[PDB]
Amino acid sequence: GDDYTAGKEYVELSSPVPVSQPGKIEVVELFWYGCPHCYAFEPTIVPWSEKLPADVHFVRLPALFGGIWNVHGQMFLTLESMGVEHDVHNAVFEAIHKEHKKLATPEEMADFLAGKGVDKEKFLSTYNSFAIKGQMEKAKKLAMAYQVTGVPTMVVNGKYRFDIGSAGGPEETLKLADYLIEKERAAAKK
């Protein structure tokens, strides 16, 4: 059959990356604070990722390219680091983009999250830890390896890179995501 073209709808990449273990196809979202096109895709992708099948494993990581790109995404890893029991994942995004709050410093972030099931004690202590450093240097080198350059950028199984500007639009990105899952799922499909 085959309904899509490389360069066109998406970009394969002649320098891939693996995971810790095979099985579920990996899907890395890579995003930033800004990216006015990425915000036009959040509520398109958020429900898609929830309603994914048992064979797909979606991840969301910060696009640490130096300067304010890494500063703004750093909080994401802290939020997780204190062990949030999936306390309101949207309202994170839905305080950055819609709300347009500056959120550019840890004193801004931890103040804001104080009302959102986060504690300043736990936030700041793990922010100022080696724990976060081991996540930053990972997400940093990972984004570079995935040929990302910028955002919005989605990556199936570290072998296919795609986005709004590959596919043609936010509803068109999901058109690639599902196709690309099948394409890699095939690899180990009996």
UniProtKB/Swiss-Prot annotation:
Listed GO CC annotations: outer membrane-bounded periplasmic space
Keyword Signal annotated: yes
Superkingdom of source: Bacteria
InterPro entries (alphabetical): DSBA-like_thioredoxin_dom, DsbA/DsbL, Thiol_disulfide_DsbA, Thioredoxin-like_sf, Thioredoxin_CS, Thioredoxin_domain
Record keywords, A-Z: Disulfide bond, Periplasm, Redox-active center, Signal
Location(s), subcellular: Periplasm
Gene3D superfamilies noted in UniProt: Glutaredoxin (3.40.30.10)
One GO BP: cellular response to antibiotic
Keyword match Disulfide bond: yes
Disulfide bridge map: 35-38
GO molecular function, one term: protein disulfide isomerase activity
Predominant location category: periplasm
Residue ranges of domain Thioredoxin in the record: 2-182
Pfam families, A to Z: DSBA
Family: Belongs to the thioredoxin family. DsbA subfamily.
Primary role: Involved in disulfide-bond formation. Acts by transferring its disulfide bond to other proteins.
Name recorded for this polypeptide: Thiol:disulfide interchange protein DsbA
Organism: Pseudomonas aeruginosa (strain ATCC 15692 / DSM 22644 / CIP 104116 / JCM 14847 / LMG 12228 / 1C / PRS 101 / PAO1)
